[PDB]
Every structure is written in C-alpha cells, then in structure tokens.
Symmetry: D2
Subunit: 115 residues, 4 copies
C-alpha cells in the first residue's frame, strides 16, 4: 500500500466516512488521466488504491469530493473539492499518506512520506 488517504471531519470530531476520492496521473500530453478511485471507510481511510508496480514516478493529483460530503450533512461548503498535487517516487519508491482535515470553509492537508 504505497498510497493511502485519511480524511477527518473538524466539525464533528470524527473520520469523514464515504468521501469519494479520485486519483489522476499526469500523462505525456499534460492531461490528467484516471489512475484510481474509491470511498473512505468508516475509519475515514482509503487503502488499496494502487500497488508498488503500478505506482511509478510521475505527477499525481488526489481529488477529494468534499462538497458532496458537506451537502449530505446539510451544510453549504465553500470549496468544490480539495486537490492535492505532488510528484511521486522521483528518487525511488516511497509510501505516501495524504491526510485532510475538513471544515465547511477551510481544509488542511498534510503528507507523511516514508521510505
């Protein structure tokens, strides 16, 4: 599991469950092509997005559908979604954990990179 996503809810003090996540990889023509997708579990985590063999060097975009999350809770959020863009495995295979803390008008994202 080289890529993991963790989403938390800052308003309810709980994991953000059933949040849709789409991952894209920048193609040779500067276009974003679908790479993987899924929904966060009851623990607010999403594992098994890819494998070490498939997760090659490149620029990846992790899109978290925050809008749908807040709408489902009856809250009108500011952002359409939260995006995290980064170059991965540029100096060898690494394990990436992308974390996001969500609020209606704000969000924070941090990355923990392991070797």
């Amino acid at each position: 599991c080289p890529l993991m996503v963790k989403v938390l809810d800052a308003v309810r003090g709980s994991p953000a469950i059933n949040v849709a996540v789409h991952v894209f990889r920048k193609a040779a023509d500067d276009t974003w092509e679908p790479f993987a997708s899924g929904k966060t579990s009851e623990s607010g985590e999403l594992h098994g997005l890819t494998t070490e063999e498939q997760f090659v060097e490149g620029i990846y975009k992790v899109e978290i559908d925050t809008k749908s999350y807040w709408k489902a809770l009856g809250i009108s959020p500011f952002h359409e979604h939260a995006e995290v863009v980064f170059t991965a495995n540029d100096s060898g295979p690494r394990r990436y954990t992308i974390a996001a803390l969500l609020s209606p008008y704000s969000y924070s994202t941090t990355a923990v990179v392991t070797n």
Copy 2:
C-alpha cells in the same frame, strides 16, 4: 500595536466576532498574572491590548474563549478554550499577530512576526 489577535470561523467562513480574549504574563513566581483582555470586533480582530512600553520581554499566554463562542451558536465544542503560549524576544522592531482559525473539534493558530 505590538500585539494583535485575529480570530476566524472555519464553519461559517467569517470573522469570529465578540470572542473573549485574555492575555497573561508569567510573573517572577511562575504564576500567570492578568495583562490585558478584550473582545474581537466585527472584523474578528482585537487591537490596542498593550503598548510598546508595557510589552516587555517575557512569557505570555493568550487565551481565547472558544467554548462560549460555539455555545452561542448552538454547537457543542471540544475544547474549553484555545491557548497560545510564547516568548516575546524583543530583539529588534517587532509586531506580533496571533491568528486562530476555529472549528468545533479543531483549531489552528499561527503567529506572524514582522
């Protein structure tokens, strides 16, 4: 204005208005003595807490009454309040801006020293 406080509401996307703020300075006996206090304005800011002459080197604590803020909005918050403890260096001309972003179960605080 050597010391300024700015509070924002992450749930409503607006300044946090009428939030009580208490500032304390560590005394010679490791005790926290009242230094200044006030409430944030409509812009979520609090200015005029002290002057350059009074704001001497020392350890200060800025306490933001976040609990009362959320209660007034009908939200049960996690924290009793938010505290920011820092040392004023006073090594050259310096203004301190303490900013806090509030959510019911989370808050972030940052300091901008210019």
Copy 3:
C-alpha cells in the same frame, strides 16, 4: 476588491512574499481559462485581481505556486502548488478573501466571505 488573496509562511512566521498566484474561471466547455494573476506583496497579500463587474457567477480556481516559493528558500516541498476551487454565489454583497498558510509538507486554506 471582490477577491483578495493572503498567503502566510508557517515556517518563518511571516507573510509569504512574491508568491505567484493565477486565477482561472471555468469556461462553457469545462475548460479553465486565465482570469487574473499576480504576485503577493510584502504583506503577503494580492489585491486588485478583478472588479465587481468582471467577477461574475461561476466556478473559479485560485492556484498558488508554492513550489517555487519553497525552492527559493532552499526547501524541497511536497506539493506542486496549492489549489482552491470554489463557486462564486453572488447572492448579495460579498467580498472573498482566500487565505493560505504554507508549510513544506502541508498547507491550510480558508475562505472568509463578508
């Protein structure tokens, strides 16, 4: 100033100066077309990006070139840039302030709509 951008540096406790910011508006064909751009001032702010007449309802993207900022400081950052995508409602008098707090491997963004 219907739209304002504020960027802070969480590592140095100062405004993030000379940070490139590009704003885009979603076109009729789901494409992002250039809308406005600039660089943050010494106060870490960027004003005068647009006017009320030009800032119509739509989906906008504010892209902050964080990578170049950290590289200039000799720090290898994680993100390529920071993006803020939002819908301008235009339901009554509204000013939008997009704030970003930057760290090498993390950033927070908040919107204050008044």
Copy 4:
C-alpha cells in the same frame, strides 16, 4: 486505550518522534495535577497513557513540548508548547485521539472522539 496522542511534523512530512507529552487533570481546587506523561514513538504516537477505570470525568490538559522538538532540529519555534484543554467523559466513557500538526510558527490540533 481511552486516550491517544498523535503528532506530525509539517516541515519534514513525518511523524514527530520523541516529543514529550504531559497530561494533567483539574483537581478539586482548580489546580492542575499530574495525570500521565510519555514520549511519542517512531510512529509519532503515544498510547497507554491511562486506563478506562482511571480516566474519569473531568477537565484534562494535554501539553505537548513542541519547543524542545524544534530546538533539537535547529529551528527557533514561536510557541513554548501546545496545549489542548477539554472536558472528558461528561456523558459517559469515550475514546479520545488528540492529533497535532506542527510547524515552527503554527500548529493545528484536532480531536477524534469515539463511542
């Protein structure tokens, strides 16, 4: 494990290791009495601070010694430490995870509460 602490480093993109944490409980005389303490592990976590039997209702303060952490890395931080104050178990036993994201001049803390 009713009380857990997780600390991350926003500058290095890694867990904050060996960070001293002190927990206090408000006594009958408005005084803070020592409750438990420890240091974060290599995963930036601190478990086994207390047990369900000992963790009774009350106001607790979790103090994270952030200053020593940054000093050890050669960075002059702004805060003396990070404090998290909250009432616990007021409506029954709960599990609390206190998370902190650290930067030299900024920190964020969030709580995840489970039943």
